[PDB]
Design a protein around this ligand. Structure first.
Ligand SMILES: Cc1ccc(-n2nc3c(c2NC(=O)c2ccc(C(=O)c4ccccc4)cc2)CSC3)c(C)c1
Ligand SMILES: Cc1ccc(-n2nc3c(c2NC(=O)c2ccc(C(=O)c4ccccc4)cc2)CSC3)c(C)c1
Lengths: 481, 482
């Protein structure tokens, strides 16, 4: 008969999944697969939050599929080795995927399409990770990706109204489509635990960001309700209505979010032409995906056509202290600790520790910061992470920043009372607000009363910002030439 | 054809702009440009008020140019790299600028003239940032700028130039501005975020930039003064004009004439006193003193600056720069400067004396750098000259008076309203203790809920001890020179 397979990679949801909906059409059987690729492997225990989030997404998908009398099939191995066996054993006729625009996903998917052709399997591809058809954006721009966000905004303004979401997969959508199940399904295709991937979980609290479409749809309605009523040092903390990690994994459709925000704006402000501020970072997300699709070395400086060439220092000792939150600047260290512990930090906090690492203080390549964020950040994948680190290190030709963050000062304006620093660095809980952001300048009496001695209980500033930043500012201006 | 470009740097206005008026004459096209030079980069969020004021000046220029069917072209890059490309691409034949007297500007403008010559572009320079032709003052004085303000007054006594008509739709005539479809994307005015500044913690400006704001303030300022014919003077006034004079949103020559006409109307007299013009001639004086002195902002190697061995104490500087000295008078002024970008002239005297010859004995150069980043109404010449003069670093201006960091505030604002506004942690403290919190009972402290050392910092020096020693240092320095 007609045996269909939907391949989950991103887009880990049943709502607004046009590839899955079209794959079910006319099908006698459906199997939803997720393939754990041993390509992604070798991470240490620091990368646990990404894996935990992913596994919780798969658990949620499996549970939602079970309400449809289906299951999620989790298969371990490389897609190129896995899919030819699946095609033969399940007698597959159709394979569906949500389009992936990133270059190595395009490479992977092109190879899998060749194998599908060899097996006589039709391939269904549908766009649903981004608001727009990125290739149409590139085509409208004469075949090259927009070089600036303003150019991107202008291109997007002329393009056809973004496609509306597809109906959720239901009892009715499935119909008489069925999922054949073996007795040992859970043993052979179950979602893995963290331990099975090798991670230590004995010292592990419950997630601040629980994965999955169910969590995301619940957050969406509360996020919309809170913003209607509205019509800070607590925004540095993880919000129970924050949606960004769910947008990265596809537990929440970005097109549904866009529509729900626009409808909210119309209902609250009684106006049909909202400002860009409404959409937050949705268009910047779309922009970095567009800039990366055709550039397989988007994540590299050397040989990358759109990346200014800058002689960053090689300093792994300084990089580690930055990555591990042991810089001596409580503001910077608190941010890296929150990132390491929970996997999300505020957007302004991302700018602060990125400027600190690259153009501001350490003169270390944006590539190294990207790799640490790649390991630790829940809500940014390869395109957006490479794009943001490039842009924020002044390595994009058309975005020169005139401003350089202060590692002490920026924190004081944001949390005058160092509540944020007292939370993520409790060893400084004694220090008062006048010294909490620069503990080195506190007298030894106030240090001892606080029961933390700089240099012993907490480390001293790793550089002098005034000295370092002035030189790096002079370095960058020379580079422009 | 005849394609003209007017280059805005200062003089961000359409009124009293003789360079732009002459550049338009005989031109087939006109484009007004502002060049964002990456040389000014590297500021932290502390420098946001200057940048915000500038961008609002540019926005206003663009909005007023749009009423003339024109646009402001904002280009990012160095003038020396930008202008040769512009000349070829737009086929420019003339380039106009308002004269800039500062050493840096003269150096930049000489390099751009050489590039213009190489391109076959005629260059138009007209004076309109100052009341007078500064070089004529210098020639009048025998080739050297006046050393003292009184000699300067004497020189201008013997010499103001009159203003040109505002650029109108009639003035533009058949001159037009060719526009690309992507103009806004390519030449639009940048936002603060595009320069890297954090705007999330930012309310609306106390000092909104732009000619339109300045001309509105000018009329209300003149009407208020006609009617009159202080603790609230420490606060920003809705009729204050000084930031607009610095950026050239308000012509200083228009202001001079309107003030003179007001005096003639109200007092029925034709010979006004110098006090009528306030800061206008001191502004002119510092521009004249600096224009030939590229090291005017330095002590060592600067010929008119007395050599004084200030201490290098960056810990003390930061407390002064961040308004954490323990003296609520000094701290309130530095806070108001950081948050808004203007403080009263007498407040400037107070925190300058405190930093240099009064208390901390830190070099006037360091105060100037903090002021250059924070202060909206003083540019390089006036800022360097003011810090030199007020730190007794000018040979011919010796001050016999040392400001008191507690007493001066009390005489100015007895209740302490000013301190309660910019330092609300001391809102509870009564007027007897608000200017010196340390000398107050712990009971009044606890009731006020600010404990010194806990909610606000303690005095960083003993003024009596420090000032006496610094006064002794100063008398010693002068004697070695005499
Ligand atoms: C270091 C870093 C890494 C990743 C992220 N990040 N995460 C996500 C997103 C991003 N980026 C971003 O929004 C992002 C947005 C703008 C710029 C920019 O240049 C720029 C240009 C002009 C004015 C202000 C700014 C750079 C990055 C969007 S979707 C989840 C960030 C903010 C920082
Ligand atoms: C620390 C500081 C920095 C800048 C300024 N400032 N701002 C602006 C201006 C100025 N200066 C000034 O008027 C200024 C005026 C006079 C003297 C002087 O020696 C002096 C000489 C005799 C009697 C009183 C005083 C010093 C500075 C004029 S246009 C905007 C000030 C007052 C202080």
């Amino acid at each position: 008969g007609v045996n269909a397979v939907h391949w989950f990679r991103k887009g880990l949801r049943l709502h607004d999944n046009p590839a899955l909906k079209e794959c079910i059409q006319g099908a006698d059987t459906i199997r939803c697969v997720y393939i754990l690729d041993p390509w992604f492997a070798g991470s240490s225990n620091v990368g646990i939050n990404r894996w935990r989030f992913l596994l919780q997404c798969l658990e949620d998908l499996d549970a939602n599929l079970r309400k449809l009398n289906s299951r999620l099939f989790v298969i371990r191995g490389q897609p190129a080795d896995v899919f030819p066996r699946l095609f033969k054993e399940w007698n597959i006729t159709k394979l569906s995927i949500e389009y992936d625009s990133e270059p190595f996903g395009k490479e992977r998917d092109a190879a899998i399409k060749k194998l599908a052709t060899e097996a006589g399997v039709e391939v269904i591809v549908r766009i649903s990770h981004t608001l727009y058809d990125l290739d149409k954006i590139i085509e409208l721009n004469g075949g090259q990706p927009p070089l600036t966000y303003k150019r991107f905004q202008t291109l997007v303004s002329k393009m056809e109204p973004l496609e509306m979401p597809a109906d959720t997969i239901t009892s009715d959508v499935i119909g008489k489509c069925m999922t054949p199940l073996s007795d040992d399904h859970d043993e052979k295709y179950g979602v893995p635990s963290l331990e099975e991937l090798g991670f230590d979980t004995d010292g592990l609290s419950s997630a601040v960001w629980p994965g999955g479409e169910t969590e995301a749809l619940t957050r969406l309605e509360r996020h919309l309700e809170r913003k209607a009523w509205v019509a800070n040092a607590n925004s540095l903390l993880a919000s129970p209505t924050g949606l960004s990690p769910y947008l990265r994994f596809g537990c929440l459709s970005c097109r549904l979010f866009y529509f729900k925000l626009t409808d909210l704006y119309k209902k609250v402000k009684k106006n049909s032409s909202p400002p860009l501020s409404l959409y937050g970072q949705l268009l910047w997300r779309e922009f970095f995906y567009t800039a990366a699709t055709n550039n397989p070395r988007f994540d590299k400086m050397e040989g990358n056509p759109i990346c200014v060439q800058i002689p960053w220092d090689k300093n792994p000792e300084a990089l580690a202290k930055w990555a591990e939150g042991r810089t001596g600047f409580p503001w910077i260290d608190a941010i890296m600790t929150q990132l390491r512990q929970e996997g999300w930090i505020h957007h302004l906090a991302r700018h602060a520790v990125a400027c600190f690492l690259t153009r501001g203080d350490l003169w270390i390549s944006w590539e190294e910061g990207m790799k640490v964020f790649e390991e630790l950040l829940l809500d940014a994948d390869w395109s957006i992470n490479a794009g943001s680190w490039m842009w924020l290190s002044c390595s994009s030709f058309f975005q020169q920043f005139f401003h350089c963050y202060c590692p002490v000062g920026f924190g004081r304006r944001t949390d005058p009372n160092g509540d944020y620093i007292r939370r993520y660095l409790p060893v400084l809980r004694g220090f008062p607000a006048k010294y909490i952001y620069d503990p080195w300048n506190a007298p030894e009496g106030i240090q001892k009363v606080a029961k933390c001695l700089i240099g012993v209980n907490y480390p001293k500033p790793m550089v002098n910002h005034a000295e370092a930043s002035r030189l790096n500012i002079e370095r960058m201006k020379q580079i422009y030439q």
